[PDB]
Amino acid sequence: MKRTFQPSVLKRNRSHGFRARMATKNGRQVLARRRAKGRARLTVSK
Amino acid sequence: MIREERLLKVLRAPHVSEKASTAMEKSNTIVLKVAKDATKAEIKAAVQKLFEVEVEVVNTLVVKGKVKRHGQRIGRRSDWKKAYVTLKEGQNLD
Amino acid sequence: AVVKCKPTSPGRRHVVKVVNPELHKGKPFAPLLEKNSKSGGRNNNGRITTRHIGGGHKQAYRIVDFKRNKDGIPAVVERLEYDPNRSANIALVLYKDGERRYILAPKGLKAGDQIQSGVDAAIKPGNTLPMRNIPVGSTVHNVEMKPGKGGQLARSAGTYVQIVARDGAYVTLRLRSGEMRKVEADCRATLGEVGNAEHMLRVLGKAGAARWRGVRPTVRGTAMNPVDHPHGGGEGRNFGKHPVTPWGVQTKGKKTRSNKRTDKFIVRRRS
RNA sequence: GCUCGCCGGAAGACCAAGGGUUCCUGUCCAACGUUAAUCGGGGCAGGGUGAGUCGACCCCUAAGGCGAGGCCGAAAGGCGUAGUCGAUGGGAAACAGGUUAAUAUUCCUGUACUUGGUGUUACUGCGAAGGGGGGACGGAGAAGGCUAUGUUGGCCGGGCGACGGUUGUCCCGGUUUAAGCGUGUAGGCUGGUUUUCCAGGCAAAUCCGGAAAAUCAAGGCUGAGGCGUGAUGACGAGGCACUACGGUGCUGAAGCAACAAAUGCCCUGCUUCCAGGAAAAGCCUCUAAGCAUCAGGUAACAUCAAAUCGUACCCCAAACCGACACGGUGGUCAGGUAGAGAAUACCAAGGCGCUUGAGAGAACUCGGGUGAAGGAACUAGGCAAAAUGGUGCCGUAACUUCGGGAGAAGGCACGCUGAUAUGUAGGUGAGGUCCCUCGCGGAUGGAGCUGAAAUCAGUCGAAGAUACCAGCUGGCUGCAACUGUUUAUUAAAAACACAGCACUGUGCAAACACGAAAGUGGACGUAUACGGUGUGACGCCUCCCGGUGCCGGAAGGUUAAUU
RNA sequence: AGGACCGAACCGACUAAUGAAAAAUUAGCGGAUGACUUGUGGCUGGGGGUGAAAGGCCAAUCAAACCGGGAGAUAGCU
């Protein structure tokens, strides 16, 4: 059965990666929040 | 024209292994560990100056670091650049 | 000519082709072509703005000349061509100076026919001249509304406009709708009817044909649930409401012209 | 190790995606592995990924994204021009063999190619953000020419049979060889060459386009395959020396022909159809500003250059997505016998026996087999099973929109052997002989090779479409015309859609829709068009305006802000 | 020629019996040149999308997704 997650690296990056996040204000905010939290992996970026 | 200083920094070590030995013996090709940033030409230059030996050609490759586990904690070894440097016919290297 | 297809399968039974042999069997004039990608009836916001558009065949855009400005140079008609972008047929013409253009093929036109734009040009089919120069009572197509703009009225397969009157700086057109409309007399117009008049006799004959023309299916409001359309819901088939668009506006009869800027030019509305 | 069994259009081989060391070697067996484990995709250590020509990067663009100014918006921000990004598409170049425990079009051996500089001598119009060409394109169909590949014969090497026969019309194996360079064929496209002029191609153009005129019927472009060379080489069945039983070193015969043949190539072709079928660069060409006897261009030749990153391994799976060593997952390769076939059966190459076994042979459950007589009596319902099942030929009703219905129904023939005919009809096609504008040419010729289908005669069986494979049929009737679509995971239908029909709106800055707006879709469309609504092929058809809507009217009554 | 026919791949899911499986199995079944199917990338966003329309689908979630916040909502009820 075709399950929901069907990985594709480029797609992932474009969607969720650092640059995408940077591009918008909300993305930036998210990043900031993550930083505040103390996340080790700030984004999906490898 | 590569700088002397740069050249010295390029070459990290000789690589000892069965394959390397074979290369040395049969094909007249030395297997070096080199700086990850070191391009082929630079490597060649280093070889020529620092070992005093004519170079036919340099093949490089990047070796990826193995992931290991020291007890409970996970940790990755560093990547490093290997270079097969083929010396010209009759060139004997110390 | 129209051709009723033999019923060798259902979905071919009711098909009627409109087969013109005089069209060019060949690749069109490539310099006048350009790319024309499909919308899916969706705007820059990415939302569907006009339902039921989608798919259909890839099509190039033939660059048709509706402005029709080569004044004084006589052109000769090289060939008639199929245009997928319109109900009419187009005609590749060749001006004496070596330029080619596509035009709407008018009714009588065929390969070898000479045509001409300009004030001086002969009042014959395919020739183009300002409506002050065109005799009253004549049938015209590809009619400009603003001088210099390009033909906007009567472009469709078997349309034409009657010049009913010329009163000073304006002329009154009897448009195909039945609307009588004032238009500046310096606005250009091509003599005769536009070509492909048996276009309306074609019958698609199956669902697939429609699809091929880029038309997705249309669901009836009454078949929906109330959350979707004003007509939705009802156990079994109910419909106890005045017909309306998906956005609640009356559909059977309610007029929607609001343009107060061009009310002056409309002599009489259609009926 | 020897048997046995299973897959073989895969359960084999090679990739992409995704994973990220799972690869190979040594070593260890606590845990992990549904049991044991000496084994492992487990633990620990070490090793392993070699590129000018494969892929990325790179040049070019599509959908789309971002977007200087800009337009718009309380703010945030939205849209968008110039531009700049974006492959899933376009763009230079490598093949064969050998090798590692583990890499190879990457190493080695041989033999190649590419496009850049730099320098040269030789020549002499070069030059783009511009012009033109080209690139550059659909579906279906039909062949014909080919090859991959296979079969048989020849050849070469080996064999003479654990049991009757087996020196022959006998048995086993092999019989392979690239890119490149040269040739330019089957075949496809197009008339060429020169001269003159011209409101066209944002300017110019010797280019393209258009007009004339002259003269020659062959000119050019394209093109699989074959042939030659590449190759006195390589590989080569197996023999022979050493042996850490893993292998290593030497050696090496023949290496042809015919027939069959793709869904691959010629073919981005041809024919045809309507639903009318990307873009931009590379590439070719034209000039402008310019420069002017300099640069630049093409000419060969020399030299230098091609960096960087990926390359292990899994990849229909125990390594990816499914919590698991548990269904899903795009591309490429496609042997034999039978067969229409990529179906099916048995096999090859290759890969596996699915990580608990051993007994026993109760009830009951699951999955199968057979069944006296009866044959739907079962049951809500013939649910399920049983049956039908192939090719050829004969034959086939109502009704019909004249296409259908129809594979209607129903029947007959079917193996093997011999003969017709030591193998026919056909297919293919070598020598020889003749012609010739000479070649991959044309004629004639028929050797050899291949080869159905039929008829007649015999013959075996209970049974010849013998297995696997492979329609059940007919009669009346509701609904929906039809092919389609639908409740991912209890509903596939009579529901939705549909061609068709009707009403209605909409004159273009269209109605309408998404947007505080700018704008965008509608549409680069223009009433034979577009939107909405209902109805739903085709046939025969299809009173009430009092109520509620809509349309038109505006005499009077009533009536807001305002005053 | 064909939204033509029979039929593998491929796409589906009508009948049947039966956790390996949070929808599968085996045996049959429908479509199979098209209103087909499929890879890669793109776009549409929550009273919003998309919908051959079932209130279907929008990450095992849908008559209004998920995450965090208002928030210790309120609970004459248990």
From Swiss-Prot, chain A:
HAMAP family per UniProt: Ribosomal_bL34
Full protein name: Large ribosomal subunit protein bL34
Entry-linked NCBIfam families: rpmH_bact (TIGR01030)
A single BP term in Gene Ontology: translation
The gene coding this protein: rpmH
Keywords tagged on the record: Ribonucleoprotein, Ribosomal protein
Organism: Escherichia coli O45:K1 (strain S88 / ExPEC)
Record GO terms (molecular function): structural constituent of ribosome
Top-rank lineage group of the source organism: Bacteria
PANTHER family given in the database record: LARGE RIBOSOMAL SUBUNIT PROTEIN BL34M, MITOCHONDRIAL RIBOSOMAL PROTEIN 34 FAMILY MEMBER
Family: Belongs to the bacterial ribosomal protein bL34 family.
Gene Ontology CC terms, in alphabetical order: ribonucleoprotein complex; ribosome
Swiss-Prot record, chain C:
Skewed-composition ranges (Low complexity): 38-47
GO terms, biological process: cytoplasmic translation; negative regulation of DNA-templated DNA replication initiation; ribosomal large subunit assembly
Domain of life: Bacteria
Gene Ontology terms, MF aspect: RNA binding; rRNA binding; structural constituent of ribosome; transferase activity; zinc ion binding
Keywords recorded for this protein, A-Z: Acetylation, Ribonucleoprotein, Ribosomal protein, RNA-binding, rRNA-binding
GO cellular component, one term: DnaA-L2 complex
InterPro entries: NA-bd_OB-fold, Rib_uL2_dom2, Ribosomal_uL2, Ribosomal_uL2_bac/org-type, Ribosomal_uL2_C, Ribosomal_uL2_CS, Ribosomal_uL2_dom3, Ribosomal_uL2_RNA-bd_dom
Region Disordered, residue ranges: 27-52, 220-271
Pfam families according to UniProt: Ribosomal_L2, Ribosomal_L2_C
Sites bearing N6-acetyllysine, chain numbering: K241
Function: One of the primary rRNA binding proteins. Located near the base of the L1 stalk, it is probably also mobile. Required for association of the 30S and 50S subunits to form the 70S ribosome, for tRNA binding and peptide bond formation. It has been suggested to have peptidyltransferase activity; this is highly controversial.
Record-stated family: Belongs to the universal ribosomal protein uL2 family.
HAMAP family reported for this sequence: Ribosomal_uL2_B
Record's subunit section: Part of the 50S ribosomal subunit. Forms a bridge to the 30S subunit in the 70S ribosome, contacting the 16S rRNA. Interacts weakly with S6 in one of the 3.5 A resolved structures. In pull-down experiments interacts with CedA.
Miscellaneous comment as given in the Swiss-Prot or TrEMBL entry: This protein can be partially replaced in vivo by its H.marismortui (HmaL2) or human (L8, from the 60S cytoplasmic ribosome) homolog.
Name of the featured protein: Large ribosomal subunit protein uL2
Organism this protein belongs to: Escherichia coli (strain K12)
